[PDB]
Design goal:
Blueprint (H helix, E strand, L loop, with lengths): L3 H14 L3 H14 L4 H5 L10 H9 L5 E8 L2 E7 L5 E8 L5 E8 L9 H8 L4 E11 L2 E8 L5 E2 L4 H15 L7 E3 L20 E3 H10 L3 H11 L1 H6 L1 H4 L13 H9 L2 H9 L2 H11 L22 E2 L1 H17 L4 H7 L11 E11 L2 E10 L4 E10 L9 H12 L1 H4 L3
Antiparallel strand pairs: 1-2, 2-3, 3-4, 5-6, 5-13, 7-10, 8-9, 11-12, 12-13
Helix pairs in contact: 6-8, 6-14, 7-8, 7-15, 14-15
The protein binds ligand J01 (2 copies).
PDB class: hydrolase
Keywords: hydrolase
Assembly: monomeric
Length: 423
């Protein structure tokens, strides 16, 4: 158990030594904060829209220092640096990178505090926020069903954002198995198929040719919305929908029509009249509205904010549905002797994982205004699997925040697995 001084020193050294895209970006961003006084444009994605306000943003950040590194948490294309400022005030620097190491998101925010968890009640009492509906569901998978380790509101259907991509993955695998689509088949990016971040594929030029395998990899590992939309277009909505009952969903009608990310963005934050039409329409009327809406996006990232999940403009499922889709994916992966499914599912575990404990970890996050979820399947080297599903929804995005809180609650549960999961 490293003492505070030990932990900070280790973090400082690790940041200095990290020879990776995240290490490069984190050191550069820390340089911005600690330094005496076009280099910016070269470090960020080409379409970085805050470039004008950025000089002021950095001035304001710098005014909060001086800063000392206390913790460093690189996780693939995501990274967090915990900083202490004067008088014991703490902040977190959050980085999200694109596929070549350019910065997409860079924030410096008040520290997200998550205590070490001893009991499930610690989890519940930490997580609870007035005005936020939450759910925690943890199970051990066994031959003859699931052993419930903890449950709060698992039966409640809730919006889950990009968790829907798990169903899309199962639908894709089902079609690969049938031979109607192939891993090396080429998908082509068109202006109409481009969606918003999360993801990187939207940044590719019109006409870019990508394999089904690479597109599915990004769909899961980067939560790539454009990747997901390319897959959903190739399979077709009917195929995606007809798959839902088999892949584990209890009431497919909640995700009919099964929306694309493009559709959620455009409907959710585009013209209000069209959105009011959705609300008053039945399934037929909604399908008709979506067909009419097909085309190039008008909605931009800056338009998002107001919650729309309460109108059905999201993907609703219960915690049991999440466990079923994950267990289904575990089965699909084992059946795939090529290891293609496994490589996609294990690429990004969402945390730094103890690989001596866990043979495989599947992970998926979901987020939309007023929506946050994280889920993991963890299987040890003996073959015992656990599934953890964390969900939050609210009428106001500010009650949820950037998702580090819920992720960090998951991190603490997994850290305390011997007490909370495998006791
Ligand atoms: O993949 C991740 O870890 C991302 C994510 C993606 C949702 O599409 O949602 C949570 C919030 C965040 O930064 N996480
Ligand atoms: O390891 C942890 O406890 C948490 C954390 C907390 C931020 O101080 O940062 C990383 C991301 C995450 O969930 N981990």
């Amino acid at each position: 158990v490293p003492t505070p001084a030990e932990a900070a020193l280790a973090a400082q050294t690790a940041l200095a030594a990290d020879d990776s895209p995240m290490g490069d970006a984190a050191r550069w961003a820390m340089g911005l904060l600690t330094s005496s006084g076009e280099d910016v444009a070269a470090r960020f994605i080409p379409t970085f829209a805050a470039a004008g306000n950025f000089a002021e943003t950095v001035r304001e950040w710098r005014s909060k220092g001086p800063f000392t590194v206390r913790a460093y948490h690189p996780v693939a294309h995501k990274g967090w640096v915990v900083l202490s400022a004067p008088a014991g005030v703490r902040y977190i620097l959050s980085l999200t990178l694109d596929s070549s190491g350019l910065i997409r998101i860079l924030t410096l925010k008040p520290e997200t505090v998550i205590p070490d968890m001893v009991t499930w009640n610690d989890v519940e009492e930490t997580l609870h926020t007035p005005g936020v509906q939450h759910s925690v569901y943890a199970v051990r998978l066994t031959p003859d069903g699931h052993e419930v380790l903890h449950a709060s509101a698992p039966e409640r259907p809730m919006p889950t954002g990009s968790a829907y991509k798990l169903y899309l993955m199962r639908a894709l695998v089902a079609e690969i198995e049938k031979g109607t689509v192939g891993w090396d088949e080429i998908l082509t990016l068109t202006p109409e198929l481009r969606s918003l971040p999360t993801g990187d594929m939207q940044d590719l030029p019109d006409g870019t040719r990508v394999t089904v395998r690479e597109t599915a990899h990004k769909m899961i590992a980067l939560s790539d919305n454009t990747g997901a939309d390319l897959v959903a277009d190739r399979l077709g909505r009917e195929v995606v929908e007809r798959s839902l009952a088999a892949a584990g969903h209890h009431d497919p009608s909640l995700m009919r029509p099964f929306l694309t990310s493009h559709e959620v963005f455009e409907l959710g934050w585009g013209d209000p009249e069209r959105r009011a039409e959705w609300v008053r329409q039945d399934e037929a009327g909604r399908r008709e509205l979506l067909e009419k809406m097909a085309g190039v996006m008008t909605v931009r990232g800056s338009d998002l904010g107001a919650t729309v999940h309460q109108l059905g403009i999201d993907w609703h499922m219960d915690a049991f549905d999440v466990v079923r889709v994950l267990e289904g994916l575990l089965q699909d992966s084992g059946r795939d002797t090529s290891g293609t499914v496994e490589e996609i599912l294990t690429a990004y575990p969402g945390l730094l994982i103890d690989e001596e404990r866990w043979r495989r970890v599947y992970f998926k996050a979901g987020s939309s205004p007023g929506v946050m979820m994280f889920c993991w399947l963890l299987q040890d080297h003996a073959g015992i699997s656990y599934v953890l599903v964390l969900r939050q929804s609210a009428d106001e995005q500010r009650l949820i925040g950037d998702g580090l809180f819920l992720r960090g609650i998951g991190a603490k549960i997994i850290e305390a697995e011997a007490k909370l999961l495998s006791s």
